[PDB]
Ligand binder design. Structure first.
Ligand SMILES: *[C@@H]1O[C@H](CO)[C@@H](O[C@@H]2O[C@H](CO)[C@@H](O[C@@H]3O[C@H](CO[C@H]4O[C@H](CO)[C@@H](O)[C@H](O)[C@@H]4O)[C@@H](O)[C@H](O[C@H]4O[C@H](CO)[C@@H](O)[C@H](O)[C@@H]4O)[C@@H]3O)[C@H](O)[C@H]2NC(C)=O)[C@H](O)[C@H]1NC(C)=O
Ligand SMILES: *[C@@H]1O[C@H](CO)[C@@H](O[C@@H]2O[C@H](CO)[C@@H](O[C@@H]3O[C@H](CO[C@H]4O[C@H](CO)[C@@H](O)[C@H](O)[C@@H]4O)[C@@H](O)[C@H](O[C@H]4O[C@H](CO)[C@@H](O)[C@H](O)[C@@H]4O)[C@@H]3O)[C@H](O)[C@H]2NC(C)=O)[C@H](O)[C@H]1NC(C)=O
Ligand SMILES: *[C@@H]1O[C@H](CO)[C@@H](O[C@@H]2O[C@H](CO)[C@@H](O[C@@H]3O[C@H](CO[C@H]4O[C@H](CO)[C@@H](O)[C@H](O)[C@@H]4O)[C@@H](O)[C@H](O[C@H]4O[C@H](CO)[C@@H](O)[C@H](O)[C@@H]4O)[C@@H]3O)[C@H](O)[C@H]2NC(C)=O)[C@H](O)[C@H]1NC(C)=O
Ligand SMILES: *[C@@H]1O[C@H](CO)[C@@H](O[C@@H]2O[C@H](CO)[C@@H](O[C@@H]3O[C@H](CO)[C@@H](O)[C@H](O)[C@@H]3O)[C@H](O)[C@H]2NC(C)=O)[C@H](O)[C@H]1NC(C)=O
Ligand SMILES: *[C@@H]1O[C@H](CO)[C@@H](O[C@@H]2O[C@H](CO)[C@@H](O[C@@H]3O[C@H](CO)[C@@H](O)[C@H](O)[C@@H]3O)[C@H](O)[C@H]2NC(C)=O)[C@H](O)[C@H]1NC(C)=O
Ligand SMILES: *[C@@H]1O[C@H](CO)[C@@H](O[C@@H]2O[C@H](CO)[C@@H](O[C@@H]3O[C@H](CO)[C@@H](O)[C@H](O)[C@@H]3O)[C@H](O)[C@H]2NC(C)=O)[C@H](O)[C@H]1NC(C)=O
Ligand SMILES: *[C@@H]1O[C@H](CO)[C@@H](O[C@@H]2O[C@H](CO)[C@@H](O[C@@H]3O[C@H](CO)[C@@H](O)[C@H](O)[C@@H]3O)[C@H](O)[C@H]2NC(C)=O)[C@H](O)[C@H]1NC(C)=O
Ligand SMILES: CC(=O)N[C@@H]1[C@@H](O)[C@@H](O)[C@@H](CO)O[C@@H]1O
Ligand SMILES: *[C@@H]1O[C@H](CO)[C@@H](O)[C@H](O)[C@H]1NC(C)=O
Ligand SMILES: *[C@@H]1O[C@H](CO)[C@@H](O)[C@H](O)[C@H]1NC(C)=O
Ligand SMILES: *[C@H]1O[C@H](CO)[C@H](O)[C@H](O)[C@H]1NC(C)=O
Ligand SMILES: *[C@H]1O[C@H](CO)[C@H](O)[C@H](O)[C@H]1NC(C)=O
Ligand SMILES: *[C@H]1O[C@H](CO)[C@H](O)[C@H](O)[C@H]1NC(C)=O
Ligand SMILES: [Ca+2]
Ligand SMILES: [Ca+2]
Ligand SMILES: [Ca+2]
Ligand SMILES: [Ca+2]
Ligand SMILES: [Ca+2]
Ligand SMILES: [Ca+2]
Ligand SMILES: [Ca+2]
Ligand SMILES: [Ca+2]
Ligand SMILES: [Ca+2]
Ligand SMILES: [Ca+2]
Ligand SMILES: [Ca+2]
Ligand SMILES: [Ca+2]
Ligand SMILES: [Ca+2]
Ligand SMILES: [Ca+2]
Ligand SMILES: [Ca+2]
Ligand SMILES: [Ca+2]
Ligand SMILES: [Ca+2]
Ligand SMILES: [Ca+2]
Ligand SMILES: [Ca+2]
Ligand SMILES: [Ca+2]
Ligand SMILES: [Ca+2]
Lengths: 72, 5, 1114
């Protein structure tokens, strides 16, 4: 399903938390939109085109607040 | 069993 | 000398057509001087301001993208022309800046590792790309005890949290190890707890697998396919090319098969693979994929020179060709060329005796001593000696003709003859008596019977006699070994033990059946253990190998025909007779699973003879196809080890050890391959190999005695007794003490007697304790099936590390030993230290105690699938059981799966008897006298069976062996077998007491009263010179009976005369109140008979309460 290993890990562990389906579904929609965000981060990282690294803070803090918001 | 002696 | 029967001297050559002998110089000369040219065989000698030049223009988001971004696998700026028609699709690979990963995408290096789907199909981390063992930085922890398909690295955000993460859930243990857990959650062995719903399921929730161990899974739903390991999967998942349950039960060749439609006649399908009518072909209509039916209209394609290169012959059809090959030639996979058939290997049954391959056809020939009958293929034996069968019942060795016309007893009265073999050189016969555990031999004219082996024969199974090197080979099923000895029974040597294959998968567990092939120096044997096989070893103990290991469950029988050199064996469970080459290749079934229970087979000419246990019949038939099956005889007892007696079944061969014992000191054994020979030493000898000879240095334990000539060494209790055992005679020296005990029994230094097992068992048993003496027990050694504690007491090899104090000083259970020891080859080792059979691994049952033998993750993989030829797979778990355990009346699958629906199970048509319940039992178990069906349906409606020659009939009409008649004890349950003996003569070499009963003669005039009336001692000459019959230590009853001195007047009527209980002797015997106290009639009553309620002495003083109640509770 998800591209990255870490999103899959969060997805199995979210199911291990037996969270409510509406909360659990909103988790993936926030992570799947982050999936497209991380992909452009990663492309600009290996190619080195992200000379300022602006795309890293905005998904790191988003993941942190995602963990806090949804009860993880 | 059935194969012993 | 003369000429061998029906053969010729090696100095000459045998004609095939008439069996006449001519010199070899007339062979291979080119002139067919024989009757049919058999001498001359052919085998002889012959806008633009919004973007920049570095970026590709896009419309809607007002973006501009680099030139290498587009046409990589996705539309970077949502451009519909990005992928399809902007770059060449495959004019080039995606170049070095993006490493190759699939054709439609490419990968820029590190992505082959991280675990993110960067090639579009996860194939970035495929094969052996990268990331063999991932690492964890700060705020991360590694799941070290894990495999690729679970996890290896997790953050501290999940260590000692509320939910297990790693494979073994070590993240929650760490140093945390909390206490609080209540009844609201299931409790695991390691201490962690989980919700009750997470018990007995498909997930490893607790890490320790405690939530799964011991569970009993209910069966799956109707829409749920079940795998062999017990995992339920949706039936939609079946045959989707994904291993949905690990073991691959849902992804296998024939379950996921869609056989193509037959369309046998008409219905001419075209080459694209769909069936269409025959008339549509070349109907000028393109109804098939690509002109499959229209070649314009077809013609033969072989007509042009070497097109398709049909090697032998060609033929055409409406739209194709097909080459063909002449008989004796087969086409190979290229569909154009032909190769020669090796009919001697591909189709052995064409020639009756021997085959020679020719390019094209084949020629059949006969071994020397056989002539080919005018049919061109069937050889006939030329000797004027007619063969006859020799097979063994439990009590008899019986003589039966090949056609079954005659039937007579060779011998009778034996205990249990389980095997036999013959020697044509001395016209002698050998057999194993399993009841007496001895090996005997006698001439075929029924004289000079003798016993050659009688010691350390725990359980012998089968024997074979080597006519060339004069060696005797036999198998032991308890020691799991193959022994060797000369025909006289000396120089015993172990030549095989443990396992055979390099993987130690096939090991000696249940040896049975043996056949020698001295021409190539090989011994073939069979084992019907869990991993049944047919092994092979050289006659000298080299070249261990496995011949047959597949489609074999119960190989009771094995033999070689010596004329075709084919190996023959039979399976009792699968019920077949199947033959193969000497190397195990090119197997062919004679009987396809139709035989009830064969035990031994043998070959002669064209006929196989086998003994059947279930029908108790001897049967014969053709050796190649089984036609002409005929029942020869049918007996009351089971038949064992049939043999065809004929000199052609032991072909003449030169002896490598000829007339010199090969120069070997003790044993000369034929080398593997037959050409050479190898010197060997017996069991208790050390092979100190020298420069040009082998030294057999004696090496015998402190409980053994070395004979005078160093010819052998024998147990220490065999020294100083009645019989001379050594050849030198040092067994019985002049300075030999008196022998107080019987044969085969250790004698104490003070005259007491004890069994040999009492020697060096750390429990002193002799009066002096001499059985545990330091000099005797210093170098004690025991059998290969036992392990010796440092206490120097021997226990069975499987009694180690079982939390049971089998030895006195816990040396078997010592933790240091239980961690460093190995298991013997073929056995599995537990973390507990237990050694268990390899079959016990992954069978649900907790055998190690620590569940080390049941790793649930590994036991459910494809590596432990049941052998579908012989084993039945349990429904609700991964256990496999043999097919013969199915609905036998016992829970073998631990979920009662094998006992479900036995009504649908049909019995074998002839060998079984259906019970009242739907179980099938062997027919030999009908009316046997014991309930075997579980409901007494086999023994109901029965009639007693008639007695045989060696049996005697009781009043209850039940037959017993005649040896039990008049032996002082009743066996019929009443007075029947001792009804009268006074006017009856009894089996020879037996002494008849005056009361009519008779005992073995060796028990006469030996002190002990072995007759009931002591008549075996009442008339004997004076044992000692000065007139005495007993040594002083023993007492002498007036009827000449010897008696231990301390038995004097102990209350037991020990002398049958009664001289033991004279009051004048009784009064003066020393006594002690706790053991022997005086009754007021001057009789020292035994202390155990006080307050017993019985008048052991005639005034009741032994029952008076005053001195046998408890004064201080005593
Ligand atoms: C049942 O069948 C068996 C087997 O056929 C018979 O046993 C054979 O009996 C014959 C006699 O009829 C034996 O022949 C004699 O062999 C001697 C040499 O071998 C024996 O002695 C050596 C000594 O070490 C042993 O190792 C060996 O095992 C043998 O015991 C010869 O020296 C004898 O020669 C003498 O007699 C012949 C004529 O018979 C004369 O020409 C000679 O000059 C000389 O006087 C003799 O040839 C034969 O050896 C036996 N076989 C075996 C294996 O021992 C049984 O006799 C037979 N029983 C019955 C009752 O039918
Ligand atoms: C195994 O078989 C042996 C056979 O010996 C039994 O062991 C002891 O056997 C002796 C037989 O003599 C028992 O009786 C003992 O006799 C000794 C000899 O008597 C001396 O004195 C007389 C006096 O006229 C002389 O004529 C004679 O020549 C001797 O000089 C006594 O000396 C013994 O008493 C002493 O030794 C025993 C242990 O041997 C002690 O128990 C006594 O307290 C005392 O010190 C004795 O009278 C003797 O009883 C047998 N032993 C025991 C313990 O009973 C074994 O009994 C038998 N196995 C078992 C298990 O019973
Ligand atoms: C008719 O014939 C029998 C024998 O044919 C006689 O029985 C013998 O009687 C004598 C005298 O009692 C016995 O000799 C004594 O044996 C004692 C026990 O030793 C036994 O065990 C050892 C070791 O295994 C054997 O070597 C030995 O043979 C015995 O089996 C010894 O201990 C005696 O020596 C003791 O006394 C002397 C002094 O006399 C001391 O100096 C020694 O140190 C020692 O303490 C003695 O050797 C003989 O063993 C008996 N033999 C049998 C077979 O029983 C009958 O007595 C005889 N009948 C009549 C009426 O005379
Ligand atoms: C299939 O093709 C093969 C290969 O040609 C055919 O074998 C050939 O068959 C012919 C006719 O039987 C044989 O010819 C005969 O040869 C002898 C000499 O040996 C000659 O005296 C006869 O007059 C005759 O010509 C030929 O030997 C044989 N070829 C070989 C090398 O074996 C076969 O007949 C074809 N089969 C069919 C059914 O088409
Ligand atoms: C098992 O049974 C077979 C068949 O009954 C026995 O074969 C018989 O063997 C004896 C001894 O070789 C033969 O006796 C001989 O007969 C001839 C002719 O009458 C006589 O001149 C000889 O002096 C001798 O007495 C007998 O003919 C032969 N029978 C057959 C059918 O071949 C065999 O001996 C038995 N085996 C055992 C171990 O008892
Ligand atoms: C005892 O018998 C076993 C089972 O037949 C033998 O195990 C064999 O071990 C080799 C090497 O581990 C396996 O080859 C492996 O194949 C995989 C691909 O499937 C590859 O990725 C590995 O690099 C390796 O080449 C082989 O599959 C396996 N046998 C079978 C038929 O599965 C073992 O060799 C025997 N004795 C020993 C030395 O333990
Ligand atoms: C010692 O043990 C080995 C294993 O049992 C024996 O080797 C086996 O010998 C047979 C007969 O020579 C071989 O069969 C032949 O193999 C060749 C190909 O090498 C093939 O062209 C023939 O048609 C035939 O199948 C068998 O393969 C071979 N097995 C192996 C792998 O060793 C050896 O003969 C034994 N030595 C003795 C004489 O004790
Ligand atoms: C008790 C036992 O047989 N232990 C054995 C040890 O003696 C040695 O043979 C070892 C070799 O790997 O295998 C194990
Ligand atoms: C086997 O038993 C049958 C009866 O069931 C009998 O007719 C036959 O003669 C026996 N076989 C022989 C030839 O001994
Ligand atoms: C199962 O048996 C078939 C024959 O019916 C055989 O071809 C196949 O190899 C066997 N498969 C297994 C699991 O051994
Ligand atoms: C002649 O020699 C052959 C060799 O196989 C046999 O021993 C045969 O028994 C002999 N014949 C006689 C009559 O002694
Ligand atoms: C006595 O005769 C019976 C019947 O004939 C048995 O054969 C028994 O074996 C005989 N024993 C003796 C000692 O002659
Ligand atoms: C008893 O037999 C012994 C054995 O040595 C003596 O020969 C003795 O003479 C025999 N007779 C008597 C009366 O003892
Ligand atoms: Ca010739
Ligand atoms: Ca692109
Ligand atoms: Ca990746
Ligand atoms: Ca956790
Ligand atoms: Ca679970
Ligand atoms: Ca599947
Ligand atoms: Ca067509
Ligand atoms: Ca051929
Ligand atoms: Ca065994
Ligand atoms: Ca098996
Ligand atoms: Ca069977
Ligand atoms: Ca002896
Ligand atoms: Ca003891
Ligand atoms: Ca133990
Ligand atoms: Ca187990
Ligand atoms: Ca069962
Ligand atoms: Ca029964
Ligand atoms: Ca009796
Ligand atoms: Ca006696
Ligand atoms: Ca007594
Ligand atoms: Ca009493």
């Amino acid at each position: 399903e998800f591209r990255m290993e870490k999103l899959n890990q969060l997805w199995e562990k979210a199911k291990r938390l037996h969270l409510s389906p509406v909360r659990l579904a909103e988790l993936h929609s926030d992570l799947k939109i982050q999936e497209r965000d991380e992909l452009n981060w990663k492309k600009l990282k290996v190619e080195g085109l992200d000379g300022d690294g602006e795309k890293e803070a905005k998904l790191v803090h988003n993941l942190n607040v995602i963990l806090a918001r949804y009860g993880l | 069993x059935x194969n012993x002696x | 000398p003369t000429r061998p029967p029906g053969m010729c001297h090696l100095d000459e050559f045998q004609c095939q057509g008439d069996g006449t002998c001519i010199p070899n110089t007339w062979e291979c000369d080119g002139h067919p001087d024989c009757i049919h040219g058999s001498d001359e065989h052919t085998g002889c000698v012959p806008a633009s301001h919004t973007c920049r030049s570095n970026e590709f223009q896009c419309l809607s988001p007002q973006r501009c993208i680099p030139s290498y971004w587009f046409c990589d696998g996705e539309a970077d700026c949502a451009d519909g022309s990005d992928e399809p028609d902007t770059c060449g699709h495959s004019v080039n690979t995606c170049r070095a800046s993006q490493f190759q990963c699939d054709n439609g995408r490419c990968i820029s290096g590190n992505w082959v590792c991280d675990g993110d789907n960067d090639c579009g199909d996860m194939s970035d981390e495929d094969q052996r790309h990268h990331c063999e063992l991932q690492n964890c930085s700060s705020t991360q922890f590694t799941c070290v005890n894990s495999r690729p398909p679970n996890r290896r690295c997790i953050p501290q955000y999940w260590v000692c949290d509320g939910d297990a993460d790693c494979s073994d859930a070590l993240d929650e243990l760490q140093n945390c190890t909390m206490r609080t857990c209540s009844a609201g959650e299931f409790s695991c062995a390691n201490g962690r707890c989980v919700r009750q719903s997470f018990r007995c399921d498909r997930r490893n929730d607790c890490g320790d697998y405690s939530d799964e161990r011991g569970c009993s899974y209910p069966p799956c739903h109707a829409n749920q396919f079940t795998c062999q390991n017990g995992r339920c999967i949706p039936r939609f998942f079946v045959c989707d090319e994904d291993n949905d349950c690990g073991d691959g039960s849902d992804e296998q060749e024939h379950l996921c098969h869609t056989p193509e439609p037959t369309c046998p006649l008409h219905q001419f399908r075209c080459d694209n693979g769909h069936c269409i009518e025959m008339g549509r072909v070349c109907n000028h209509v393109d109804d098939c994929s690509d002109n499959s039916d229209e070649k314009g209209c077809g013609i033969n394609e072989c007509l042009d020179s070497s097109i398709s290169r049909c090697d032998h012959n060609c033929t055409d059809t409406i739209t194709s060709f097909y080459c063909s090959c002449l008989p004796g030639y087969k086409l190979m996979s290229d569909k154009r060329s032909c190769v020669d058939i090796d009919e001697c290997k591909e189709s052995p049954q064409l020639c009756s005796q021997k085959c020679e391959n020719v390019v094209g056809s084949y020629i059949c020939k006969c071994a020397p001593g056989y002539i080919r009958e005018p049919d061109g293929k069937s050889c006939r034996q030329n000797s004027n000696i007619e063969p006859y069968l020799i097979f063994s019942n439990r009590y008899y060795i019986r003589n039966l003709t090949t056609d079954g016309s005659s039937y007579s007893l060779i011998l009778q009265g034996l205990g249990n003859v389980v095997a036999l073999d013959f020697d044509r050189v001395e016209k002698r016969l050998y057999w194993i008596d399993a009841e007496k555990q001895i090996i005997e031999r006698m001439f075929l004219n029924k004289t000079n019977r003798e016993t050659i082996i009688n010691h350390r024969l725990r359980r012998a199974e089968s024997l074979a006699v080597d006519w060339v090197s004069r060696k005797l080979y036999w198998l032991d099923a308890i020691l799991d070994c193959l022994f060797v000895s000369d025909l006289e029974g000396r120089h015993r040597k172990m030549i095989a033990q443990h396992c055979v294959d390099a993987n130690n998968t096939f090991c000696f567990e249940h040896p049975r059946g043996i056949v020698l092939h001295p021409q190539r120096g090989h011994v073939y044997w069979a084992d019907w253990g869990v991993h049944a096989y047919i092994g092979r070893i050289g006659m000298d103990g080299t070249n261990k190998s496995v011949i047959i290991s597949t489609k074999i469950e119960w190989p009771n029988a094995i033999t070689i025909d010596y004329t075709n050199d084919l190996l023959y064996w039979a399976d009792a469970h699968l019920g077949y007779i199947e033959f193969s080459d000497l190397e195990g290749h090119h197997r062919h079934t004679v009987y396809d699973g139709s035989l009830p229970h064969p035990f031994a087979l043998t070959i002669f000419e064209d006929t196989v003879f086998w003994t059947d246990w279930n029908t108790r019949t001897v049967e014969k038939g053709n050796k190649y196809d089984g036609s002409g099956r005929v029942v020869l005889v049918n007996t009351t007892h089971k038949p064992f080890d049939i043999h065809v007696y004929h000199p052609y079944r032991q072909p003449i061969m030169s002896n490598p050890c000829g007339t010199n014992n090969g120069g070997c000191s003790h044993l000369c054994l034929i080398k593997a391959g037959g050409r050479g020979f190898t010197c060997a030493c017996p069991d208790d000898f050390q092979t100190v190999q020298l420069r040009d000879r082998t030294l057999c240095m004696p090496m015998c334990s402190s409980t053994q005695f070395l004979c005078g000539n160093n010819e052998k060494c024998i147990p220490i209790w065999w020294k100083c007794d009645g019989q001379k055992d050594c050849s030198d005679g040092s067994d019985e020296p002049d300075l030999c003490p008196h022998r107080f005990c019987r044969l085969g029994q250790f004698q104490c230094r003070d005259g007491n007697c004890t069994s040999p097992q009492a020697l060096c068992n750390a429990r002193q048993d002799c009066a002096d304790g001499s059985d545990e003496d330091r000099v005797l027990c210093e170098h004690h050694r025991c059998e290969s099936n036992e392990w010796q504690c440092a206490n120097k007491r021997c226990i069975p090899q499987s009694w180690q590390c079982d939390s049971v104090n089998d030895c006195l000083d816990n040396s078997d259970e010592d933790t240091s030993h239980c961690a460093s020891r190995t298991c013997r080859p073929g056995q599995f080792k537990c973390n507990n230290g237990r050694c268990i059979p390899q079959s016990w691994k992954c069978d649900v049952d907790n055998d190690c105690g620590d569940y080390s033998d049941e790793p649930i993750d590994e036991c459910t993989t494809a590596a432990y699938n049941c052998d579908n030829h012989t084993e039945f797979s349990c429904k609700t778990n991964y256990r496999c059981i043999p097919q013969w355990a199915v609905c036998n009346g016992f829970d073998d699958c631990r979920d009662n799966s094998d006992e479900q629906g036995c009504e649908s199970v049909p019995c074998h048509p002839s060998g079984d008897f259906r019970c009242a319940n739907h179980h099938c039992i062997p027919l030999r178990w009908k009316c046997d006298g014991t309930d075997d069906c579980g409901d007494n349906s086999d023994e109901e409606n029965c009639v007693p069976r008639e007695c045989s020659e060696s049996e005697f009939r009781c009043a209850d009409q039940q037959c017993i062996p005649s040896r039990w008649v008049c032996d002082q004890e009743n066996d019929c349950g009443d007075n029947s077998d001792e009804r009268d003996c006074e006017m009856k003569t009894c089996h020879p070499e037996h002494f008849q007491c005056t009361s009519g009963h008779c005992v073995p003669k060796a028990l006469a005039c030996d002190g002990r009263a072995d007759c009931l009336d002591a008549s075996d001692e009442s008339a004997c000459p004076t044992r000692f010179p000065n007139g005495t019959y007993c040594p002083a230590a023993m007492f002498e009853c007036k009827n000449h009976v010897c008696i231990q001195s301390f038995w004097i007047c102990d209350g037991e009527n020990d002398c049958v005369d009664g001289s033991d209980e004279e009051i004048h002797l009784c009064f003066n015997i020393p006594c002690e109140s706790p053991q022997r106290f005086r009754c007021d009639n001057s009789r020292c009553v035994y202390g155990h008979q006080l307050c017993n309620g019985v008048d052991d002495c005639g005034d009741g003083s032994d029952e008076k309460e005053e001195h046998c109640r408890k004064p201080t509770h005593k």
